[PDB]
Structures are given as structure tokens and as C-alpha cells.
């Protein structure tokens, strides 16, 4: 079909209720994909949640280093535009997985981290603080970490981090964006802040280079973000948007992305919004 047609269908499917029914039909995990390393004894407590585990085939491996991390490569192709948006989708680091987290950032010299969670919710820890408050310095896995600046806006915090390999003295800089107005299992507190945020992340991409995206589990809020960025790329190029196909393609790479029907409904309505704005 066309962008125009796909959007008529989405509009009708949201009134019809069929869009949600089909979302609830979709598999959460791709059947037949091995999940083995994540379940080994030495790796079980490296998972924040027992039911959110990487597939063997797309799990992130550390360079020259056997340590397991709950993280997955998620690549979203738009072939009609010779385009691939790369991500690494991961959970919120635990106290004892911060070393592996920063090792991924260093291995691939990732310049952008997107964190879609507060550190705590209702008196419970959702993510370990894996960076120091300025001006303090932090040791993780043989990396020294400092926050060179920190600025709060309405919906998110923008931080610049310096990562130093202690043995070599080689330095790497990373932009860190923490979206604090988006509860676990829910939708963004404000759709317009969300859409501005997503477009901002797009503008900070460097081609070829994955964006590291995480929340608490790294599937619900991360899935919504990935869906929306994909839809934005498609709408600007007058290409058809089928959100169910987008969700499935993510779930083929990390199970359960986009967690709730409310999240899916949210992102579909946001997709329609942006389409109506673009003409």
C-alpha cells in the first residue's frame, strides 16, 4: 500500500478494535529462538527480571571478554531508503553489572545512551546509578567515569560523560539522556514531550553507530521509542507504516518489546498524530 493507505487502515483499526486484537495475538517471544546463556547459573543474577532474557543469536558479546550481559542488538531496516537504524537494547544495570555496561559502551565507542526510567519508583530500585553525581569520579570495570555536565529540562536530563580506560589513559565521551516522565508499564506523561524527545534522539544519532537504549527491563519503554523512531523515518519518506510488523521485527531481536496494549495504543495514536501534522 501507501503511507496514506496504511494510515487510513490504522485509523479504522483503532476505531474497529482490531489493531489491539492483533497486537494481543502477536507472540511475545519468537518461538524456536534459543535462550540458553542467560539461564546459566553464573548468569541468572545478571538479569534484573527472570522473564526478560536475550536470545542467544542477538545477545551482545563483549570484545575479547567472555562476561555475559543482558543486552541485545536490535536493528530496524527501512530498505526502500537504504537505511538501518541500529540499537543496543538493554536492562537497567544492576550494582554488579555496571562494569559490563560500560564495557559495551567502550567496545563500540557508543556516543549516545538513552535511559527511559527513573532510578526508583514507589520506594523500589528500578536501575542502579551507574554514573557519579558531578563532580565525583567513579570506577567501573577498569574504567573511570565522570559527569562533565548535567542539565535538567521538563521531561529529561541531559548529561555529558567522560569514560577513561585507566590502563591506557584513552578517553571517550558519551551523551546520556534520562527521560524521567515515563513510568514503567505505562505511557509517557506527556505525548508532546515524548515526540520532541524522540526527534531529538534522532538528530543526535551518528550513522553506522548503535544508540544504546535502556529502561528497567529494556523492553517496554524501549520498544515504544524504537517503534516511534522507525515510524518517523517512514513518514518522512512517504512509506507505509504497519506498527504490528514493526513490533514483530523488534521482538525477533529482543523478546517482549512494547509491553502493554496501552503502550501499543499510545504509539499508534502518536503515529497517526505525526502523520497528520506532516502534510
Amino acid at each position: 500500500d501507501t503511507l496514506e493507505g496504511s494510515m487510513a487502515q490504522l485509523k479504522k483499526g483503532l476505531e474497529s478494535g482490531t489493531v489491539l486484537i492483533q497486537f494481543e495475538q502477536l507472540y511475545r517471544k519468537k518461538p524456536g529462538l534459543a535462550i540458553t546463556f542467560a539461564k546459566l547459573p553464573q548468569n541468572l543474577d545478571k538479569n534484573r527480571y527472570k522473564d526478560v532474557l536475550p536470545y542467544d543469536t542477538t545477545r551482545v558479546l563483549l570484545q575479547g571478554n567472555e562476561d555475559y550481559i543482558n543486552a541485545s542488538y536490535v536493528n530496524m531496516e527501512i530498505p526502500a531508503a537504504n537505511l538501518v537504524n541500529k540499537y543496543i537494547a538493554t536492562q537497567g544495570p544492576l550494582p554488579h553489572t555496571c562494569a559490563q555496561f560500560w564495557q559495551v559502551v567502550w567496545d563500540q565507542k557508543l556516543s549516545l545512551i538513552v535511559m527511559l526510567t527513573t532510578l526508583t519508583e514507589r520506594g523500589r530500585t528500578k536501575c542502579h546509578q551507574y554514573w557519579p553525581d558531578p563532580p565525583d569520579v567513579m570506577n567501573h570495570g577498569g574504567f573511570h567515569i565522570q559527569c562533565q555536565s548535567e542539565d535538567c529540562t521538563i521531561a529529561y536530563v541531559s548529561r555529558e560523560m567522560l569514560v577513561t580506560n585507566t590502563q591506557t589513559g584513552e578517553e571517550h565521551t558519551v551523551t546520556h539522556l534520562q527521560y524521567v516522565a515515563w513510568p514503567a508499564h505505562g505511557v509517557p506523561d506527556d505525548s508532546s514531550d515524548f515526540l520532541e524527545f524522540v526527534n531529538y534522539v534522532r538528530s543526535l544519532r551518528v550513522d553506522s553507530e548503535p544508540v544504546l537504549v535502556h529502561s528497567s527491563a529494556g523492553i517496554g519503554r524501549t520498544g515504544v521509542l524504537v517503534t516511534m523512531e522507525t515510524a518517523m523515518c517512514l513518514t518522512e519518506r512517504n512509506l507505509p507504516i504497519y506498527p504490528l510488523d514493526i513490533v514483530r521485527k523488534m521482538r525477533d531481536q529482543r523478546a517482549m518489546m512494547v509491553q502493554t496494549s496501552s503502550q501499543y495504543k499510545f504509539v499508534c495514536e502518536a503515529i497517526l498524530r505525526v502523520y497528520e501534522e506532516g502534510l
Partner: peptide, 6 residues
């Protein structure tokens, strides 16, 4: 260990 979906 806890489940996220719970």
C-alpha cells in the same frame, strides 16, 4: 527473582 510482567 521477580517477573517484569507481574
Amino acid at each position: 527473582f521477580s517477573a517484569y510482567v507481574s
